[PDB]
A paper describes a structure:
In [name], the main causative agent of common scab disease of root and tuber crops, the interaction between the substrate-binding protein (SBP) [name] (CebEscab) and cellotriose released by the plant host (K D in the nanomolar range) is the first event for the onset of its pathogenic lifestyle. [name] is the sugar-binding component of the [name] transporter, proteins CebF and CebG form the transporter permease, and the energy for active cello-oligosaccharide transport is provided by the multiple sugar importer ATPase MsiK. CebEscab adopts a cluster B-type substrate-binding protein (SBP)-fold as described by Berntsson et al.. It is composed of two domains connected by three hinge regions.
We obtained the crystallographic structure of CebEscab in complex with cellotriose at a 1.55-Å resolution. The CebEscab structure contains residues 62–454. The elongated ligand binding pocket is located at the interface between the two domains. An electron density corresponding to the whole cellotriose molecule is observed in the ligand binding pocket, clearly establishing the two β-1,4 links between the three β-D-glucoses. The reducing end (D-Glc1) is more inserted in Domain 2, whereas the non-reducing end (D-Glc3) makes more interactions with Domain 1. Cellotriose is stabilized in the pocket by a few hydrophobic interactions and numerous H-bonds, nine of them being mediated by eight water molecules surrounding the ligand. D-Glc3 provides the highest contribution to the binding of cellotriose, being involved in ten H-bonds and three hydrophobic interactions with the sidechain of W303 (parallel stacking), F70, and M123. D-Glc1 and D-Glc2 follow with 7 and 6 H-bonds, respectively, the latter being involved in an additional hydrophobic interaction with F282. It, therefore, seems that an important part of the interactions between Domains 1 and 2 is mediated by the cellotriose molecule itself. The ligand would, therefore, be responsible for the closing of the sugar-binding pocket, a phenomenon termed as induced-fit ligand binding mechanism.
Numbering used by the authors: 62 to 454
Write the structure that this text describes.
């Protein structure tokens, strides 16, 4: 009889994991609903406007790591201190810190983290003459993104008709960038995306792959890209664990069991989110309890076991739910073992308030231009112009 609504983006996985049903069994007086804006690009500016005005908010709001520093910095007075509801000792300290203010309030509780790996179609790799065993696949490119592109060139030589090695240029760039500790900001808060040699180098390698026909001409997280998943149009993609939510959500039933997961060239992090509670909502108390419960170790373990998003709560890593986890898309692959290995040297990244919009510009206003037939130099100039306009106004 008390309705609690979550405002989400993407595929958080709470509903699919049965977590709302579990909670409603514990608390029969609670009715959980959600509203979803598919792309964070569309979700976040609306969230910010809703927080500013106090109008249009849900009882709980999700926040991506690309935006969390802006939410903590400018909207913390509008958010409940969840340090009294969730336990600091449950979370990775660096994760806890991302959602916390200098005043000692924790206004966002961590969901997942994004240790980098590569998800691939065993059948398409086998058809092209590549290994399909995950250890052998990982050995193709251990320690080197150049060896990853070389493996793509080999795939292209024998590729099944109408398939590309990878789904998108954006996904490849995000993967290459994921191994950097300082991507777009340094520890002093300086925006470094234009001067960090690793960013330009990742962009140019992505452009090389694009020019060589290794990647689909697709922006990620759009209906046409969903169709490329459905119709088996690519052999591999960058796979932080939450990408499994997308693969499972957009695949045809026939693809169940046909994917597997290899270690990436380098350890990396792409993504991670949080739940926050607007403090002035009529249900803030119940919302805070629900938010803390959804992000507690047991519930993070359950979500991993069903949807594949990897916990930010280390006690979960020793649970059977994680250790023995499988995913429908990956058959009998031990995804707990695989992602534990991918997470062992996960970089603790310097974040900043405009990470999200920088990422967006480098991908959707950057490397996509190369698959559209622009030079790498034109693509970079376009990205810089686009990002700088966002940062400067
Ligand atoms: O699905 C749940 C997981 O979401 C992860 O965030 C991703 C968003 O779901 C997705 O909408 C967004 O897509 C971006 C894309 O990365 C960017 O290159 C393009 O220009 O714009 C798209 C639309 O915003 O990507 C993010 C990842 O950066 C969370 O990281 C994860 O915690 C969560 O479980």
């Amino acid at each position: 009889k008390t309705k609690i609504t979550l405002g989400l983006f993407g595929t958080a996985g709470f509903e699919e994991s049965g977590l709302y049903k579990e909670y409603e069994k514990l608390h029969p007086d609670v009715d959980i609903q959600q509203t979803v804006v598919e792309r964070n690009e569309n979700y976040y500016p609306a969230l910010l406007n809703h927080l500013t005005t106090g109008s249009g908010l849900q009882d709980i709001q999700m926040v991506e790591v690309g935006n969390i520093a802006e939410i903590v910095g400018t909207q913390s007075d509008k958010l409940l201190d969840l340090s009294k509801y969730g336990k600091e000792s449950d979370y990775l300290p660096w994760k806890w810190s991302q959602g916390s203010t200098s005043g000692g309030q924790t206004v966002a509780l961590g969901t997942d983290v994004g240790p980098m790996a590569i998800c691939y179609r065993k059948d398409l790799f086998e058809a092209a003459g590549l290994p399909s065993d995950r250890e052998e696949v990982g050995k193709l490119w251990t320690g080197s993104w150049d060896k990853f592109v070389d493996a793509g060139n080999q795939y292209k030589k024998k590729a099944p008709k109408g398939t590309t090695f990878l789904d998108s240029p954006g996904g490849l760039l995000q993967a290459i960038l994921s191994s950097e500790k300082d991507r777009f900001y340094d520890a002093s808060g300086k925006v470094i995306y234009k001067t960090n040699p690793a960013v330009k180098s990742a962009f140019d390698l992505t452009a090389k792959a694009a020019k060589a026909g290794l990647v689909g001409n697709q922006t990620q997280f759009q209906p046409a890209w969903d169709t490329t998943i459905a119709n088996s149009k690519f052999a591999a993609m960058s796979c932080p664990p939450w990408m499994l939510g997308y693969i499972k959500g957009k695949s045809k039933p026939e693809a169940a069991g046909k994917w597997d997961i290899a270690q990436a060239p380098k350890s990396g992090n792409w993504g991670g989110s949080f739940l926050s509670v607007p403090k002035n909502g009529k249900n803030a108390e119940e919302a805070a309890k629900l938010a803390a419960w959804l992000t507690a170790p047991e519930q993070q373990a359950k979500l991993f076991a069903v949807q594949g998003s990897f916990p930010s709560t280390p006690a979960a890593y020793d649970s059977a739910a994680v250790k023995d986890a499988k995913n429908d898309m990956t058959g009998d692959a031990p995804i707990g073992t695989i992602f534990a290995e991918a997470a062992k040297n996960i970089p603790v990244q310097t974040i900043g308030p405009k990470d999200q919009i920088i990422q967006q510009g480098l991908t959707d206003n950057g490397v996509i231009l190369v698959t559209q037939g622009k030079s790498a130099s034109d693509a970079w100039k376009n990205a810089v112009k686009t990002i700088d306009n966002a940062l400067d106004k």
